[PDB]
Design a protein around this ligand. Sequence first.
Ligand SMILES: OC[C@H]1O[C@H](O[C@@H]2[C@H](O)[C@@H](OC[C@H]3O[C@H](O)[C@@H](O)[C@@H](O[C@H]4O[C@H](CO)[C@@H](O)[C@H](O)[C@@H]4O[C@H]4O[C@H](CO)[C@@H](O)[C@H](O)[C@@H]4O[C@H]4O[C@H](CO)[C@@H](O)[C@H](O)[C@@H]4O)[C@@H]3O)O[C@H](CO)[C@H]2O)[C@@H](O)[C@@H](O)[C@@H]1O
Ligand SMILES: OC[C@H]1O[C@H](O[C@@H]2[C@H](O)[C@@H](OC[C@H]3O[C@H](O)[C@@H](O)[C@@H](O[C@H]4O[C@H](CO)[C@@H](O)[C@H](O)[C@@H]4O[C@H]4O[C@H](CO)[C@@H](O)[C@H](O)[C@@H]4O[C@H]4O[C@H](CO)[C@@H](O)[C@H](O)[C@@H]4O)[C@@H]3O)O[C@H](CO)[C@H]2O)[C@@H](O)[C@@H](O)[C@@H]1O
Ligand SMILES: OC[C@H]1O[C@H](O[C@@H]2[C@H](O)[C@@H](OC[C@H]3O[C@H](O)[C@@H](O)[C@@H](O[C@H]4O[C@H](CO)[C@@H](O)[C@H](O)[C@@H]4O[C@H]4O[C@H](CO)[C@@H](O)[C@H](O)[C@@H]4O[C@H]4O[C@H](CO)[C@@H](O)[C@H](O)[C@@H]4O)[C@@H]3O)O[C@H](CO)[C@H]2O)[C@@H](O)[C@@H](O)[C@@H]1O
Ligand SMILES: OC[C@H]1O[C@H](O)[C@@H](O)[C@@H](O)[C@@H]1O
Lengths: 140, 140, 139, 140, 140, 140, 140
Amino acid sequence: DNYIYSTEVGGVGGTPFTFMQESGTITSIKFNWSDQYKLLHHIEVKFINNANIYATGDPKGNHEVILEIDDDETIIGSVIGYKKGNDGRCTGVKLTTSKGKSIMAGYFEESLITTYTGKLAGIKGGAGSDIDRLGLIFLK
Amino acid sequence: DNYIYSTEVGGVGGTPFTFMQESGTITSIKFNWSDQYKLLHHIEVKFINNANIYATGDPKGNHEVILEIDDDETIIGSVIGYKKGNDGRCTGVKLTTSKGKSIMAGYFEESLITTYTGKLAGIKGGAGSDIDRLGLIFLK
Amino acid sequence: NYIYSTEVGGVGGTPFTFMQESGTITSIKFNWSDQYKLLHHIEVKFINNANIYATGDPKGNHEVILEIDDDETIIGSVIGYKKGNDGRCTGVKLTTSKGKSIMAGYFEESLITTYTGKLAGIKGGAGSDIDRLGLIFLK
Amino acid sequence: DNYIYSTEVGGVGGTPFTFMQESGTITSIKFNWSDQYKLLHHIEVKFINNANIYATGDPKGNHEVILEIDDDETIIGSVIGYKKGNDGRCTGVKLTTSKGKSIMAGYFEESLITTYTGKLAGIKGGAGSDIDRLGLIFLK
Amino acid sequence: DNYIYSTEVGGVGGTPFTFMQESGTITSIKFNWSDQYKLLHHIEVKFINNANIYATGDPKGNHEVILEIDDDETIIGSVIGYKKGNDGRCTGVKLTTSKGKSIMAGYFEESLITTYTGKLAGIKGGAGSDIDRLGLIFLK
Amino acid sequence: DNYIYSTEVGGVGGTPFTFMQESGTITSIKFNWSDQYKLLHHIEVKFINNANIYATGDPKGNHEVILEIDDDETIIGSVIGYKKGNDGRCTGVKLTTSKGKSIMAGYFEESLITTYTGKLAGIKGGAGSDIDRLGLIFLK
Amino acid sequence: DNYIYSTEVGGVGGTPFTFMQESGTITSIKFNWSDQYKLLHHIEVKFINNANIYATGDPKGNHEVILEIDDDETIIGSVIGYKKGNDGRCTGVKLTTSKGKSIMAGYFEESLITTYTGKLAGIKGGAGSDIDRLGLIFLK
Ligand SMILES: OC[C@H]1O[C@H](O[C@@H]2[C@H](O)[C@@H](OC[C@H]3O[C@H](O)[C@@H](O)[C@@H](O[C@H]4O[C@H](CO)[C@@H](O)[C@H](O)[C@@H]4O[C@H]4O[C@H](CO)[C@@H](O)[C@H](O)[C@@H]4O[C@H]4O[C@H](CO)[C@@H](O)[C@H](O)[C@@H]4O)[C@@H]3O)O[C@H](CO)[C@H]2O)[C@@H](O)[C@@H](O)[C@@H]1O
Ligand SMILES: OC[C@H]1O[C@H](O[C@@H]2[C@H](O)[C@@H](OC[C@H]3O[C@H](O)[C@@H](O)[C@@H](O[C@H]4O[C@H](CO)[C@@H](O)[C@H](O)[C@@H]4O[C@H]4O[C@H](CO)[C@@H](O)[C@H](O)[C@@H]4O[C@H]4O[C@H](CO)[C@@H](O)[C@H](O)[C@@H]4O)[C@@H]3O)O[C@H](CO)[C@H]2O)[C@@H](O)[C@@H](O)[C@@H]1O
Ligand SMILES: OC[C@H]1O[C@H](O[C@@H]2[C@H](O)[C@@H](OC[C@H]3O[C@H](O)[C@@H](O)[C@@H](O[C@H]4O[C@H](CO)[C@@H](O)[C@H](O)[C@@H]4O[C@H]4O[C@H](CO)[C@@H](O)[C@H](O)[C@@H]4O[C@H]4O[C@H](CO)[C@@H](O)[C@H](O)[C@@H]4O)[C@@H]3O)O[C@H](CO)[C@H]2O)[C@@H](O)[C@@H](O)[C@@H]1O
Ligand SMILES: OC[C@H]1O[C@H](O)[C@@H](O)[C@@H](O)[C@@H]1O
């Protein structure tokens, strides 16, 4: 195959999403999260050479972070916080890049995945009011 | 054009501004901010081979920082603090350069972007009494 | 064709061996509790094999997953345990050739710092808890 | 024109000074400052191959620091503390060199500039009872 | 004669042991120690290409550590804690390897040796209820 | 001709001294200082291939430090503490060498110089009961 | 002749000792010290290719440290604590080696020397009940 699919962590809930393009990798990713519910609620992605925003979940949280990614820039560290099980949720993300940039969204009070690394190509999971489930997708 | 436009973060308010000159990159950037309102209020920029000062917003704040940038010097780290939403504002900036220089202006109490990196060429956004909206522009 | 790291913990539980000629370990998951301060359950996936190999009882309130690139090795590895006949594994720390690390469970009694290299399988004893755990590496 | 002029920071007050010599770069720089007023008061400079001492301001402060600079030694980091506006003053300086030497004079309670870097050739500004205004000058 | 013998530290007590094999170097070493007596009590060693476990002392302590050693891996730091004199004992060990592995057993409340370094080939000393005396053996 | 004279810091008092030899560099330097007066009182220097001690001031202090300097060893960092003005004194010294050796004598409660660097050749200043004034001398 | 003699620090008391052998450098050195008197009391040295133990002073202290030194291993840092004057003593030693090994014996409450560096070949000084005086000897 062309792509590495990291494990989707969290619950079975929400509307499914899959954001990926062969015409370009992820150039921007935004996480929205709340202190009220200590969850991720909403994620937006942009791809190289495309102004259109791909969004999932409900932007109801009181914080957001954006990581912008240079064309030649990779994810060298990547950690997702979540509550496990059928009624699980994603609670937080830490990404670190080949250029020393990092972002930190939300909370890490239960379970963690340390994911595959590489060129971030897309995301996949389930979202409604919250991010139920998140899986990263990388190139080779 | 043949430039990278970082996302404009903050609100829709203020008078639009675009500071860019074909005959050069940014050589000096000044941020004015207040402890009263915890916002950026005013930005001034100078370009290589141009003694003109390009200013936006109202210099009402009680603090200022200036970063001066050598001709061969790049931004390798860059973070803008902001309040999100239609009535948003820029609250702070942290820049770090290829030569270990850094500045820190204002506050980081809600949302952050970690932007693209490279040769800082210009800025763009909206300002009135405050900096409503700010986006960096880099060369390729 | 393999290096067997020492199995640490008790003599209890049903014996298990997870290894495949088909590939190395691509994912490992540890489940542990704050109630009992033990590892309870481990799942492993191998390269080119969609089967999940599981041992123990996933009753704990925490889990961690490490995913491992095909060319990625373990360069540091520490297992916490209670020693003796009624011993248990209490925790794991792994660190990889690509700067990734995980930490599961507790380290309140005994430690092994294991051999290093390409993680190929695991071996030990499990029931309600992980009684005994040993890593297996390639040469 | 074959020199880099860093921004003069502080007020419009004081008697203007320019210390620069065709004979060489700066070999010694001394800052005098007070805890009473939390200001720089006085600066002395010596140049390569020149026994003359160039002084400005009033040496009334209770502290002084001297940086001596080897012929081949550059400033790789430089920060000036100041009060901004017409009635402004310089409050402090931090210099760091290509050889791991640093100095720190005075206070940093309001505004900062992170200046250009390079071979320090001269200084320029305004002084009376205090250092009103200071700007560094570097070679290329 | 083509081995380096580190000093045996501790007392003259216990039954003498030497763990060394022509068959290879040490691949595993285990230290057992107590908080009750703040002593090492028991040591087990395994060698390359030899399934036999060599043990000395009484495993009565409430802690144990194992260091496993790759075939190509050396000791680059090594410190043994002991009580000196005829009635001495080994109280603790810190070993650090060419691959950034380290272990720490027991206590360091009186005397220390920082030993020779290299490929750990064997150990030698005296043990009964406690480890009376310990000496490391390296290759040349 | 081919020596660098660092600034003499401290007061105008004391008996003048100048210790230098064309035949060789400083191989040992000793500082004596007191907690009573928080001053340097006495300095001794030895030169390469010469057992004779060159001394100034009064060894009345309750502490001494010696730095010994290998033939190929340089000073890469050097800081003298002093009280400024006509009735000034040297209060302390920190030296750091090309081989990671450092010494620290006395107190730093008023003024500092960070001196030139290089091969320490001699010293020069004024001493009586105290070290009134000290300047380092380096080669090229 | 082929040796560097570091300064003997401490008092004039005790029986003089010189430990040196031309058939090898120091392979082991032991320092014995007390908390009672805060002094070094006793030193033992072994040389390469010589099973004889060379000892001076009275082993009455409640602590000992041993450093073992590989054939190719040098001292890169070395500090001796002492009381100065005719009735002086050595109070402590810190050695650091080319292989990252270090030891620390006794106390450092008055005077320090940072000695020459290199291959430790011998020691020299005066001892009775205490180590009155100690000086290191290095090769070239
Ligand atoms: O770049 C951002 C933005 O800039 C331009 O838009 C701006 C904004 O719409 C707005 O900016 C000015 C206001 O900023 C904040 O809202 C406040 O600082 C506000 O001050 C009023 O409210 C404060 C909070 O309580 C209060 O402390 C102030 O005193 C003030 O309220 C008093 O004064 C105002 C004005 O004089 C009166 O209208 C009020 O009634 C009130 O006075 C009463 O109460 C007082 C206190 O008790 C009392 O002393 C007095 O006697 C009275 O009883 C700021 O006004 O508005 C700007 C209009 O100039 C507007 O330009 C645009 O460029 C936009 O595009 C851009 O995004
Ligand atoms: O580099 C800066 C600047 O330098 C040159 O310009 C300067 C300035 O114009 C100015 O600098 C000195 C003055 O700085 C401040 O204004 C004050 O620090 C001022 O001191 C007065 O105020 C102090 C704070 O209250 C006070 O502590 C002082 O005592 C003083 O006030 C007393 O003395 C003044 C002068 O004699 C009187 O006018 C006051 O009434 C007061 O005296 C009464 O009250 C006293 C206190 O209670 C009491 O003891 C006394 O008995 C009386 O009752 C500083 O003087 O002025 C400088 C002139 O020396 C001038 O050079 C230029 O180079 C410029 O370009 C540059 O920017
Ligand atoms: O590696 C070291 C050494 O090992 C081998 O040699 C060892 C030693 O000779 C020795 O090691 C075990 C002893 O260690 C310490 O000395 C003590 O822990 C000692 O226990 C006695 O003392 C303790 C501290 O006071 C005490 O808590 C213990 O109860 C015990 O003292 C009681 O029991 C002993 C033995 O039964 C009696 O003799 C005492 O009188 C006392 O009993 C009375 O008091 C009790 C406390 O109140 C009370 O309960 C009771 O009713 C009575 O009134 C450890 O024995 O001895 C080892 C033998 O086991 C020996 O192996 C060799 O290999 C050697 O070469 C090596 O160097
Ligand atoms: O694993 C803990 C424990 O679980 C159950 O009690 C049984 O399977 C035991 O054999 C085992 O030791």
